[PDB]
C-alpha cells in the first residue's frame, strides 16, 4: 500500500537532514509528513506490487545539478533552500523506491545500499 516504502525513503532523507543540518524536530516532522504525502500522491498511479520494476524510473529520486523537484518544494515548506539542500544531502544521490525494496546509491560509481526489504 506504499506507506512502508515511502516512509523508509523519507526516513532516510530526514536522517540526513537531522545529522548534517541544524534542523529542529518540529521542522523535521513537517518535512517527513509533507514528503510522505507528496510522494504518495506522486506514486499513486505508478505502483505495481506484482511488477516492482514497472514505474521504477518514474519513482526514482535523483539529486544532480538539479535538486529533485518534490524534495525542493517540501523542503521550502520548512524553510530550506535548494542551495542548503545541495549542501546537506549527498551530491550524487539516486534513491529507488519500489514495492518491497528501497535502495540507494551515492555517486555514479558508489555501492548500492538497501534501506528496506520485505517479503510479498
From Swiss-Prot:
Keywords for this protein: Phosphoprotein, Transcription, Transcription regulation
Q: Which GO terms describe its molecular function?
A: transcription corepressor activity
- Single biological process term from Gene Ontology: negative regulation of cell population proliferation
Could you state one GO cellular component term attached to this entry? cytosol
The reported result of mutating residue 108 to A is: Impairs interaction with CNOT7. Inhibits CNOT7 mRNA deadenylase activity
**Effect the entry attributes to changing residue 96 to A:** Abolishes interaction with CNOT7 and CNOT8; impairs anti-proliferative activity
What top-level branch of life does the organism fall under? Eukaryota
User: What does this protein do, in the record's words?
Assistant: Anti-proliferative protein; the function is mediated by association with deadenylase subunits of the CCR4-NOT complex. Activates mRNA deadenylation in a CNOT6 and CNOT7-dependent manner. In vitro can inhibit deadenylase activity of CNOT7 and CNOT8. Involved in cell cycle regulation. Could be involved in the growth arrest and differentiation of the neuronal precursors. Modulates transcription regulation mediated by ESR1. Involved in mitochondrial depolarization and neurite outgrowth.
Report the sequence similarity comment from the record: Belongs to the BTG family.
Q: Indicate the quaternary assembly.
A: Interacts with PRKCABP. Interacts with CNOT7 and CNOT8; indicative for an association with the CCR4-NOT complex. Interacts with PIN1, inducing mitochondrial depolarization.
Q: Which protein are we looking at?
A: Protein BTG2
Organism from which the protein derives: Homo sapiens (Human)
Name the lineage: Eukaryota, Metazoa, Chordata, Craniata, Vertebrata
Amino acid at each position: 500500500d506504499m506507506l512502508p516504502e515511502i516512509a523508509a525513503a523519507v526516513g532516510f532523507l530526514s536522517s540526513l537532514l537531522r545529522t548534517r543540518g541544524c534542523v529542529s524536530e518540529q521542522r523535521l516532522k513537517v518535512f517527513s509528513g509533507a514528503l510522505q504525502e507528496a510522494l504518495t500522491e506522486h506514486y499513486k498511479h505508478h505502483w505495481f506490487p506484482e511488477k516492482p520494476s514497472k514505474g521504477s524510473g518514474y519513482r526514482c529520486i535523483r539529486i544532480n545539478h538539479k535538486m529533485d523537484p518534490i524534495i525542493s518544494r517540501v523542503a521550502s515548506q520548512i524553510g530550506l533552500s535548494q542551495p542548503q539542500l545541495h549542501q546537506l544531502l549527498p551530491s550524487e544521490l539516486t534513491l529507488w523506491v519500489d514495492p518491497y525494496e528501497v535502495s540507494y546509491r551515492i555517486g555514479e560509481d558508489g555501492s548500492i545500499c538497501v534501506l528496506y526489504e520485505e517479503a510479498p
